[PDB]
Amino acid sequence: NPEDCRQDPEANKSPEECKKLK
Numbered sequence: 001n002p003e004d005c006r007q008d009p010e011a012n013k014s015p016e017e018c019k020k021l022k
Helices: 015-020
Strands: none
Touching: none
């Protein structure tokens, strides 16, 4: 979820989470 990745600074900070979160 791109919008969810860019939603949470904590998540976006870690590529693995933006990989995890589609």
